[PDB]
Amino acid sequence: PSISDPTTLLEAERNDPDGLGLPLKSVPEKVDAYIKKQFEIIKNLEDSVVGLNPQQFIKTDYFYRTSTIFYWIKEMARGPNKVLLVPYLVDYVLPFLIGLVKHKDVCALASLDPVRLYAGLGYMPIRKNHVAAIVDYVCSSNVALSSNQTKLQLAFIQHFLSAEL
């Protein structure tokens, strides 16, 4: 956060009336937009995989992007970076991970594990602000989910509710 003054840090943390302060760490706005642009590139590239089998899906730019963003999320979800990931959960990261789960043979040809990753994201340090948005996202019924995605959403709501007792 590199705040200019100790008193500016103190005022900024006292400004939220709930007595929980600001996040300890935060992404600067150009870095934030770079992170979001990688997911929007993936969302525009979805048209390039609509017809094809896993063996050539593994040879697409869409998959190379997706496999990189999987390794980025998976490394961000360890150690001191989990807080950097909670701002991207309901808009980009969770939508991306349920997206990957449709491609179960791609997750077998490349040794990816969207299931273990997404279920494990229920245990991250999520703020009171983000709990309500996480709850409205997981409580959104879309008929577009297959059983694997809806039972993954229940698995999340299992490791989330138990981690929100």
Question: Which residues bind to other proteins, rule: CB under 8 A?
Answer: 53-55, 102-105, 108-109, 113, 115-116, 119-120, 146-148, 155, 158-159, 162, 165
Tell me the three state secondary structure of residue 165.
coil
Provide, rounded to whole angstroms, the least separation between the CB of residue 119 and other proteins: 5
* Identity of the residue, 8 or 146, whose beta carbon is nearer to other proteins in the bound complex: 146
* b/e per residue 62-73 (b: at least 16 CB within 10 A): bbeebbebbeeb
* Identity of the residue, 54 or 95, whose beta carbon is nearer to other proteins in the bound complex: 54
C-alpha 117/C-alpha 74 separation (Å) is 7
* Identity of the residue, 35 or 93, whose beta carbon is nearer to other proteins in the bound complex: 93
Provide, rounded to whole angstroms, the least separation between the CB of residue 155 and other proteins: 8
Provide, rounded to whole angstroms, the least separation between the CB of residue 116 and other proteins: 5
* Identity of the residue, 23 or 120, whose beta carbon is nearer to other proteins in the bound complex: 120
Residues 28-34: contacts with CB under 8 Å, at least 24 apart: 32/87
* Identity of the residue, 10 or 108, whose beta carbon is nearer to other proteins in the bound complex: 108
Crossing angle between the packed helical segments 114-121 and 94-101, to the nearest 10 degrees: 150
Residue appearing with tokens 């929007």 = 40
Helix-then-strand count for the chain, H and E: 10, 0
Residue appearing with tokens 């245990």 = 123
Q: Are 36 and 93 in contact (CB under 8 A)?
A: no
Provide, rounded to whole angstroms, the least separation between the CB of residue 149 and other proteins: 9
Provide, rounded to whole angstroms, the least separation between the CB of residue 132 and other proteins: 20
